[PDB]
Every structure is written in C-alpha cells, then in structure tokens.
RNA sequence: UUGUCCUCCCGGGCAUCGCCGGGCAGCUACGCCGCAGCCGAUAAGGCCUGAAAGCAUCUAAGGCCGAAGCGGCCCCCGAA
C-alpha cells in the first residue's frame, strides 16, 4: 500500500444536487441531469456536508489512479450540469 | 451403293452397322439458364474522456469507429 487510506473531496456548487445509490452517482443541475456509475473494488463514493467523497482503505498506485480518475469525471459532470461544453471546428 | 449367295423380278443373309449420306427420342457440351451484400463483434490502425505524474498523454479504468478475415441471414445432409 502507498499510503493508509485515499480520500479525494469534490465540491458541490450551490443549484447542483449530487446522489448516491450504491455505485451510481446522479448529478442534477440548472441545465440538466446526469448519470454515471462508478465502480473500482474497495473504492465507496459519498456525500458529506457539501462534498462528494471517494474514499479507499489502503490503497495501491492503480486504486490512486482510479480515484483521481473518478474525482475528474465527477467534476467534470458538475461543469457539465453547471455550464455545459463547447467545441469549435474549422472547415 | 460394291462383292457374293438365295435362278431372274420383288424381297432378303453375310462382308466392322459391309461402306456412305441424313437422322427424331435419349445422353451430352462446344449450347443455354442461376449464384445477397447487409447486419453483429473484432485484428492492425485512426480517435474521445482521463489520472497515475496539479501539465501532457488513444490506456491504467471507460467509450466511438475500423478488414476479401470471424458469427448470422442463404444453400445441402439431418429424430440414433
């Protein structure tokens, strides 16, 4: 193990209400709604206070991969809910 | 139509079906008719999102495409 145990925090915006159901994570915001599941072994997904918590009990470096990688895709569907995305392209 | 024999005519036997020309049915080819490009998952390869490694990154998790090649549609055998 690289450490005791992982905890990675991600901020919820004000209008944006995050969900749990076992390895689902729903996001709903202004512009929309979201649903994604997340799973990895050992790895449990929460909400705490105004934050949702990816947390694991002595991780590996694979399982510290993993988590940042579902703390970025998490923030990522808050961007999303909360603004939304936009690609340019030229001809 | 040739040689021979049945005496000659007619009509017949044998000589490779005696030889030659044509020849329907049948069998044949040199003759004629018929033989789908769509769906699904992939290899090489081209990409999206994405951390390990505050950046970057097609890869570690995940996702979309992508072969006369693989599976199905099709054909033949098939209740021991």
């Given at each position: 193990?690289?450490?005791?145990?992982?905890?990675?925090?991600?901020?919820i915006?004000?209008?944006?209400?995050?969900?749990?159901?076992?390895?689902?994570?729903?996001?709903?915001?202004?512009?929309?709604?979201?649903?994604?599941?997340?799973?990895?072994?050992?790895?449990?997904?929460?909400?705490?206070?105004?934050?949702?918590?990816?947390?694991?009990?002595?991780?590996?470096?694979?399982?510290?991969?993993?988590?940042?990688?579902?703390?970025?895709?998490?923030?990522?569907?808050?961007?999303?809910?909360?603004?939304?995305?936009?690609?340019?392209?030229?001809?």
């Amino acid at each position: 193990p690289v450490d005791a145990w992982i905890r990675e925090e991600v901020e919820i915006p004000e209008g944006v209400e995050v969900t749990v159901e076992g390895y689902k994570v729903k996001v709903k915001g202004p512009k929309g709604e979201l649903e994604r599941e997340f799973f990895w072994p050992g790895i449990q997904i929460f909400t705490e206070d105004g934050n949702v918590v990816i947390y694991k009990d002595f991780p590996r470096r694979k399982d510290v991969a993993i988590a940042r990688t579902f703390a970025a895709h998490i923030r990522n569907m808050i961007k999303g809910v909360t603004e939304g995305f936009t690609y340019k392209l030229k001809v």
